Design a protein around this nucleic acid. Structure first.
Ligand SMILES: [Mg+2]
Ligand SMILES: [Mg+2]
Ligand SMILES: [Mg+2]
Ligand SMILES: [Mg+2]
Ligand SMILES: [Mg+2]
Ligand SMILES: [Mg+2]
Ligand SMILES: [Mg+2]
Ligand SMILES: [Mg+2]
Ligand SMILES: [Mg+2]
Ligand SMILES: [Mg+2]
Ligand SMILES: [Mg+2]
Ligand SMILES: [Mg+2]
Ligand SMILES: [Mg+2]
Ligand SMILES: [Mg+2]
Ligand SMILES: [Mg+2]
Ligand SMILES: [Mg+2]
Ligand SMILES: [Mg+2]
Ligand SMILES: [Mg+2]
Ligand SMILES: [Mg+2]
Ligand SMILES: [Mg+2]
Ligand SMILES: [Mg+2]
Ligand SMILES: [Mg+2]
Ligand SMILES: [Mg+2]
Ligand SMILES: [Mg+2]
Ligand SMILES: [Mg+2]
Ligand SMILES: [Mg+2]
Ligand SMILES: [Mg+2]
Ligand SMILES: [Mg+2]
Ligand SMILES: [Mg+2]
Ligand SMILES: [Mg+2]
Ligand SMILES: [Mg+2]
Ligand SMILES: [Mg+2]
Ligand SMILES: [Mg+2]
Ligand SMILES: [Mg+2]
Ligand SMILES: [Mg+2]
Ligand SMILES: [Mg+2]
Ligand SMILES: [Mg+2]
Ligand SMILES: [Mg+2]
Ligand SMILES: [Mg+2]
Ligand SMILES: [Mg+2]
Ligand SMILES: [Mg+2]
Ligand SMILES: [Mg+2]
Ligand SMILES: [Mg+2]
Ligand SMILES: [Mg+2]
Ligand SMILES: [Mg+2]
Ligand SMILES: [Mg+2]
Ligand SMILES: [Mg+2]
Ligand SMILES: [Mg+2]
Ligand SMILES: [Mg+2]
Ligand SMILES: [Mg+2]
Ligand SMILES: [Mg+2]
Ligand SMILES: [Mg+2]
Ligand SMILES: [Mg+2]
Ligand SMILES: [Mg+2]
Ligand SMILES: [Mg+2]
Ligand SMILES: [Mg+2]
Ligand SMILES: [Mg+2]
Ligand SMILES: [Mg+2]
Ligand SMILES: [Mg+2]
Ligand SMILES: [Mg+2]
Ligand SMILES: [Mg+2]
Ligand SMILES: [Mg+2]
Ligand SMILES: [Mg+2]
Ligand SMILES: [Mg+2]
Ligand SMILES: [Mg+2]
Ligand SMILES: [Mg+2]
Ligand SMILES: [Mg+2]
Ligand SMILES: [Mg+2]
Ligand SMILES: [Mg+2]
Ligand SMILES: [Mg+2]
Ligand SMILES: [Mg+2]
Ligand SMILES: [Mg+2]
Ligand SMILES: [Mg+2]
Ligand SMILES: [Mg+2]
Ligand SMILES: [Mg+2]
Ligand SMILES: [Mg+2]
Ligand SMILES: [Mg+2]
Ligand SMILES: [Mg+2]
Ligand SMILES: [Mg+2]
Ligand SMILES: [Mg+2]
Ligand SMILES: [Mg+2]
Ligand SMILES: [Mg+2]
Ligand SMILES: [Mg+2]
Ligand SMILES: [Mg+2]
Ligand SMILES: [Mg+2]
Ligand SMILES: [Mg+2]
Ligand SMILES: [Mg+2]
Ligand SMILES: [Mg+2]
Ligand SMILES: [Mg+2]
Ligand SMILES: [Mg+2]
Ligand SMILES: [Mg+2]
Ligand SMILES: [Mg+2]
Ligand SMILES: [Mg+2]
Ligand SMILES: [Mg+2]
Ligand SMILES: [Mg+2]
Ligand SMILES: [Mg+2]
Ligand SMILES: [Mg+2]
Ligand SMILES: [Mg+2]
Ligand SMILES: [Mg+2]
Ligand SMILES: [Mg+2]
Ligand SMILES: [Mg+2]
Ligand SMILES: [Mg+2]
Ligand SMILES: [Mg+2]
Ligand SMILES: [Mg+2]
Ligand SMILES: [Mg+2]
Ligand SMILES: [Mg+2]
Ligand SMILES: [Mg+2]
Ligand SMILES: [Mg+2]
Ligand SMILES: [Mg+2]
Ligand SMILES: [Mg+2]
Ligand SMILES: [Mg+2]
Ligand SMILES: [Mg+2]
Ligand SMILES: [Mg+2]
Lengths: 63, 50, 112, 77, 247, 91
RNA sequence: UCUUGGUGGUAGUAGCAAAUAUUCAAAUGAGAACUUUGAAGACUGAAGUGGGGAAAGGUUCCACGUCAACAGCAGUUGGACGUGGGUUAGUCGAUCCUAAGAGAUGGGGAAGCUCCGUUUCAAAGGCCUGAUUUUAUGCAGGCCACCAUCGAAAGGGAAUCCGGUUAAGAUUCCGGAACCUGGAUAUGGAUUCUUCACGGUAACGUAACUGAAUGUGGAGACGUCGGCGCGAGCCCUGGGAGGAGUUAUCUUUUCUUCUUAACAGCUUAUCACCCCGGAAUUGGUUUAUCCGGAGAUGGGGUCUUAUGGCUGGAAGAGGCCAGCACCUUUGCUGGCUCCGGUGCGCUUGUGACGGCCCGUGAAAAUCCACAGGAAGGAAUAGUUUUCAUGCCAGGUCGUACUGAUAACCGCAGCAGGUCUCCAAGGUGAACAGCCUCUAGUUGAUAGAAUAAUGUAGAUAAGGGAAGUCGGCAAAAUAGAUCCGUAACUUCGGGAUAAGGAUUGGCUCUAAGGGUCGGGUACGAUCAACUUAGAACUGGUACGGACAAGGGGAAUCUGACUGU
RNA sequence: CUCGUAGCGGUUCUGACGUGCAAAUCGAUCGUCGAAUUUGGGUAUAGGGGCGAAAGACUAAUCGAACCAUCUAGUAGCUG
């Protein structure tokens, strides 16, 4: 029941956090998730063919 | 030590077989002076020192 | 959760005493002692792991057949098909250079 | 413990003169809609290995268990 | 009245050199007929790191002249020597960095390394990283060669003594501060037990000639006679002068 | 962004050891950690491999060199000296 | 302050108070605070008061009998006493190898006990013959330039797992299923009329597919940290098939079973490689920026088998149930043991990388491969016993138990000390503290009463260091989020400076993914916990227990970390 | 480098105890906690010797020269 309350979003405020934000969820973990999202998307668009290999190479380094 | 030398175990065997009380009929013999075992050894009272 | 023990009398976490918790047909968790991982054989010239050859601990090589231990080329299980190609080419052009050097030295000693 | 998937090699195994025994094990595999069948396992006891032939057809099974060599000791289940 | 720390060093118990991780003794090839009359070609196979030694070590394979096998000699690597380079050793070898030549067969002002003091002792002089020997003279009659040593010493040695062309690799190594006690710890950990050093003025009089007193001071001259004995040579032994190099 | 003003690679040492000692370590750490150009394959891939050992990752070739640089000025001087001596002896 | 022995007073006295804690009944017994069993209550709380081991001990293990002494109360109990029983190995260790080192010999030294030295300045040595009848095979050639031996139950190392089983043994016994070494030895297959295989451009493949001296190479064989990825086991969770709990009420509910070992076959991969191809409009690409005319991307392939999958092992075992037997010999019969998911999770293995070093992180036994080409073999047969099957053997010693608030050392059953492995749920950043599950314990002299003085823990009006040598002791502060952050500085810091706000619950909202596709203007579906915001609500409480910096201005001193 | 567990120490209470649980412990508070780290086992150094990041520290509760035995019933103008 506490897990279901957490999954709705309860008991997760400033009075309930004891670790730092990077202790609770690391900023590098967030970055790795995001960059893998952008790189999977770029690879998908290149392999489909709606993005060519030069706009891919600009957007890969921009990501 | 549970991983013994044979020589260690052989002295253990001798000490085990000497760990017994006096046999009772030796107290009945003619001109006996022995009352008890004066070389009796326990694991809790005196170590046999290898 | 079930907890396990070392099965041999070594109690320490050495290289030779590595374990693996496995579940048995009797439903329980037992430690299983793991042998050390085999290292692949290396090229005698460049040092890279050379392909095709079975990766065994060294006394296990006496039990497998010759096929697992050998490539069917010259220097088969010793060198790595690029070092072999390099040494064939190095050989051949050096004897051709040797006969050119022989003829040139003979000419410059028979001319002056 | 090896799996022979060839009836010719299995009948060749049963007469190798180190073989004395073979068990015949009946399993029952009733799946959802595919095959509600009983499966037989002929396991012949060599000196070094135990060879198993799995036969999923019962008519194919009955002719094999009838066709086993006569001197060979068969255990059933 | 106690035997002091420098007197305990000669007993060689805990003051031995730490020799497990070293590759072997670095020597020249033996002075045989091939090097005495012609040359021989070896091959650099590896340039490896020797523990406790600032200079890298070349492993050079020669063919055995009298048996069919290979001889691996351990050289001190000269700067510029690379793996796969042929090394030529002998009287007839050429002036190339890494080549091993007798010093009589070598011109003037030539930079050499791993120099024999006597012909056949297989390398004695200019072995530390960055060090070299200048050839500063030749006396062909009763064959002798004047060399300059890394300490500045002039020295006449035999022309049949062999050296290796080039400087020893690893130079500039003492140009870095260690910055910290742990880098000196790991430096001396694979040399020998000679660090850390307690000062003798910081000891009791039983431990050192400089020991004792109500302030840390020496109290007699730190300059000791050459004709002094063990236990007395703790200071500046046989000093011709002292103090800063200031005129 | 430019994270440090002048400490560079010596920013691992914090405030310790003295600024002159850190500036002296800086010029040799930049040199020993720099990638150098291989004389054999033309690629700038030579790393340091326990000082005096300068290994190219591609082409797998190892050169004996200085402790913190692949070449020292003294060794370049010595190569020019041996080149001049060899050229004036065998000519 | 004699020596040895004995005995007093003090004195039925000081004391037997750390480790939260016991209680009721029955049984046994002469006798029960303390034994056993039931019941209740608690604790250790997985860095355990649990399960095993290393050293050490040595029978303490287990059963039966038993209480004079010992267990600083008791005792019917016991690590006590008396009497027995118990330790099963080709596969686990030793044994073997070398390590730092120890140490013979040869030789030198020393009056000598002995010292040095360890390959030295020694005449230091034993191995196959290519396979047989003048051979107990040598009286044939031929090779090796090495040089005692000891030294690790944590290094290296041939090979075994599961299930059952005892009062006490088990990777050792039994049952089934393997594997290794050494030996003997046939059969089948392969190979030979081109004598010592064939295929693929290749990387390489295969059931085999001669190979001496000698040489070469590999494995053995290796640091540490970081993130990443993958696997295993654990944890979490859905469906279903059983069993138990709760049920005044609610709860498709709470707990629990749902397993698959060594070994074997077939498959399976990062890396690496090969073929085609020829690249600037530079492309591929990792969390981390490396790679490409020294041939990239791309398109085909090859490989190692870490690891996983399927199958065999093997469901016949193990587990959960049902029904009937109910001093039944002692069971018998039957059913189910199935299908998923999830992830910065925990532990561990591992891969490819990166960083660090004036530090670059053992050796040997042992096994294999290659190079070479000595020698030998093709017609009712030789070779390989590196292919398959078959036959025989595997010795010696250790093995019980504790491993510690009672089995070890500390004069003892001593709050000390003594090396290591495994590791559930919640809160929470957390292997913190706190509570619980499995397992274990409930042991430590007790009972009554509640004086002073103690020890340990606290609270305190008003003042706030006036106390004291000195703020000693205590209090204050504390997590996290947001704001703000001076002097000085070696420009790295100082810094969490200083200071200041916010924090619960409930109900919502908004973001942030994965699978999913195209014509020679389109979304089903699945899953997670992070952050931000808002309303409402309350005796303005909210890091509500636990956990958790006091700060600043300066001076002397030693640079720092360290000892 | 830092905060802080485990670990490793040992600041302060000059707390407890001080015929102790203990010939050095107990409790709280502290230092440090990824390396000059901590530690097992093997090995080496032996008494005027060793070893010492130095305190005359430590070398089996022994250290400004360990322990054992002998010389030795050492000698004492000193004490009983
Ligand atoms: Mg809430
Ligand atoms: Mg909240
Ligand atoms: Mg709160
Ligand atoms: Mg926190
Ligand atoms: Mg975290
Ligand atoms: Mg970051
Ligand atoms: Mg023995
Ligand atoms: Mg004891
Ligand atoms: Mg292969
Ligand atoms: Mg001394
Ligand atoms: Mg001394
Ligand atoms: Mg000294
Ligand atoms: Mg030495
Ligand atoms: Mg030193
Ligand atoms: Mg100094
Ligand atoms: Mg000094
Ligand atoms: Mg002093
Ligand atoms: Mg003093
Ligand atoms: Mg003196
Ligand atoms: Mg002095
Ligand atoms: Mg001074
Ligand atoms: Mg003097
Ligand atoms: Mg008296
Ligand atoms: Mg007396
Ligand atoms: Mg008395
Ligand atoms: Mg009394
Ligand atoms: Mg009393
Ligand atoms: Mg008391
Ligand atoms: Mg108590
Ligand atoms: Mg009763
Ligand atoms: Mg009571
Ligand atoms: Mg009760
Ligand atoms: Mg509790
Ligand atoms: Mg018992
Ligand atoms: Mg009794
Ligand atoms: Mg009593
Ligand atoms: Mg009594
Ligand atoms: Mg009792
Ligand atoms: Mg008893
Ligand atoms: Mg007994
Ligand atoms: Mg008995
Ligand atoms: Mg074994
Ligand atoms: Mg040996
Ligand atoms: Mg000796
Ligand atoms: Mg002599
Ligand atoms: Mg011995
Ligand atoms: Mg041995
Ligand atoms: Mg061993
Ligand atoms: Mg090792
Ligand atoms: Mg071992
Ligand atoms: Mg072995
Ligand atoms: Mg078993
Ligand atoms: Mg047992
Ligand atoms: Mg079998
Ligand atoms: Mg096999
Ligand atoms: Mg074939
Ligand atoms: Mg190999
Ligand atoms: Mg590291
Ligand atoms: Mg680091
Ligand atoms: Mg998984
Ligand atoms: Mg097995
Ligand atoms: Mg196995
Ligand atoms: Mg490609
Ligand atoms: Mg670990
Ligand atoms: Mg062999
Ligand atoms: Mg070969
Ligand atoms: Mg063989
Ligand atoms: Mg036996
Ligand atoms: Mg035995
Ligand atoms: Mg046993
Ligand atoms: Mg046991
Ligand atoms: Mg045990
Ligand atoms: Mg136990
Ligand atoms: Mg014991
Ligand atoms: Mg004792
Ligand atoms: Mg005591
Ligand atoms: Mg105790
Ligand atoms: Mg005790
Ligand atoms: Mg916790
Ligand atoms: Mg419980
Ligand atoms: Mg008590
Ligand atoms: Mg007040
Ligand atoms: Mg007040
Ligand atoms: Mg005030
Ligand atoms: Mg005031
Ligand atoms: Mg005052
Ligand atoms: Mg006053
Ligand atoms: Mg004051
Ligand atoms: Mg005070
Ligand atoms: Mg205070
Ligand atoms: Mg914040
Ligand atoms: Mg602040
Ligand atoms: Mg300040
Ligand atoms: Mg604010
Ligand atoms: Mg809230
Ligand atoms: Mg002062
Ligand atoms: Mg200081
Ligand atoms: Mg630190
Ligand atoms: Mg710290
Ligand atoms: Mg304390
Ligand atoms: Mg006190
Ligand atoms: Mg602390
Ligand atoms: Mg401190
Ligand atoms: Mg610190
Ligand atoms: Mg820290
Ligand atoms: Mg750190
Ligand atoms: Mg020892
Ligand atoms: Mg010693
Ligand atoms: Mg003396
Ligand atoms: Mg002292
Ligand atoms: Mg004495
Ligand atoms: Mg006398
Ligand atoms: Mg007297």
């Amino acid at each position: 029941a506490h897990a279901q309350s957490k999954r709705e979003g309860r008991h997760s405020g400033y009075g309930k956090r004891k670790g730092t934000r990077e202790a609770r969820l690391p900023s590098q973990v967030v970055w790795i998730r995001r960059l893998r999202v952008l790189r999977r998307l770029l690879a998908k668009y290149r392999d489909a063919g709606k993005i060519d290999k030069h706009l891919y190479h600009v957007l890969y380094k921009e990501s | 030590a549970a991983q013994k030398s044979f020589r260690i175990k052989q002295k253990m065997a001798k000490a085990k077989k000497q760990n017994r009380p006096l046999p009772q009929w030796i107290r009945l013999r003619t001109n006996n002076t022995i009352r008890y075992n004066a070389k009796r050894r326990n694991w809790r009272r005196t170590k046999m020192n290898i | 959760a079930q907890r396990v023990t070392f099965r041999r009398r070594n109690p320490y976490n050495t290289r030779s005493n590595k374990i693996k918790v496995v579940k048995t047909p009797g439903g329980i968790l037992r430690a299983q002692h793991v042998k050390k991982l085999a290292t692949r054989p290396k090229c005698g010239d460049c040092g890279s792991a050379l392909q095709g050859i079975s990766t065994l601990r060294p006394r296990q090589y006496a039990t497998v057949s010759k096929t697992h231990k050998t490539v069917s080329r010259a220097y088969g299980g010793s060198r790595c098909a690029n070092c072999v190609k390099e040494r064939i080419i190095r050989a051949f052009l050096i004897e051709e250079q040797k006969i050119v050097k022989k003829v040139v030295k003979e000419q410059t000693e028979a001319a002056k | 413990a090896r799996e022979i998937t060839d009836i010719k090699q299995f009948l060749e195994l049963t007469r190798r003169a180190d073989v004395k025994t073979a068990t015949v094990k009946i399993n029952k595999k009733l799946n959802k809609a595919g095959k509600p069948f009983r499966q037989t396992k002929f396991k012949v006891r060599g000196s070094s290995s135990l060879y198993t032939l799995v036969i999923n057809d019962a008519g194919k099974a009955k002719k094999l268990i009838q066709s086993l060599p006569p001197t060979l000791k068969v255990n059933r289940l | 009245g106690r035997v002091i720390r420098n007197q305990r060093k000669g007993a060689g118990s805990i003051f031995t050199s730490h020799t497990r991780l070293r590759q072997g003794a670095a020597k020249l090839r033996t002075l045989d007929y091939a090097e005495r009359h012609g040359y021989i070609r070896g091959i650099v196979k590896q340039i490896v790191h020797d523990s406790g030694r600032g200079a890298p070590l070349a492993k050079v394979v020669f063919r055995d002249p009298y048996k069919y096998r290979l001889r691996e000699e351990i050289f001190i690597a000269n700067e510029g020597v690379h793996t796969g380079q042929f090394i030529y050793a002998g009287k007839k070898a050429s002036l190339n960095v890494g080549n091993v030549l007798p010093l009589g067969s070598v011109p003037e002002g030539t930079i050499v390394s791993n120099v024999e003091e006597k012909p056949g002792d297989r390398g004695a002089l200019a072995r530390a990283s960055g060090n070299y020997v200048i050839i500063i003279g030749h006396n062909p009659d009763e064959n002798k060669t004047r060399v300059r040593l890394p300490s500045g010493a002039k020295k006449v040695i035999s022309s049949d003594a062999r050296g290796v062309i080039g400087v020893i690799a690893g130079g500039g190594r003492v140009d870095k501060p260690l910055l910290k006690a742990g880098r000196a710890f790991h430096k001396y950990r694979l040399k020998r037990n000679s660090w850390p050093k307690t000062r003798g003025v910081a000891m009791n009089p039983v431990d050192h000639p400089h020991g004792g007193g109500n302030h840390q001071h020496i109290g007699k001259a730190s300059t000791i006679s050459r004709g002094a004995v063990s236990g007395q040579k703790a200071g500046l032994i046989a000093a011709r002068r002292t103090g800063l190099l200031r005129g | 962004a430019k994270r440090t003003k002048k400490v560079g690679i010596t920013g691992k040492y914090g405030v310790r050891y003295g600024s002159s000692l850190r500036r002296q370590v800086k010029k040799l750490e930049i040199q020993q950690h720099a990638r150098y150009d291989c004389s054999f394959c033309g690629k700038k891939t030579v790393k340091r491999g326990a000082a005096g050992i300068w290994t190219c990752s591609c082409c797998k070739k190892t050169v004996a060199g200085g402790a913190y640089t692949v070449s020292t000025a003294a060794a370049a001087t010595v190569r020019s000296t041996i080149r001049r001596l060899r050229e004036m002896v065998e000519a």
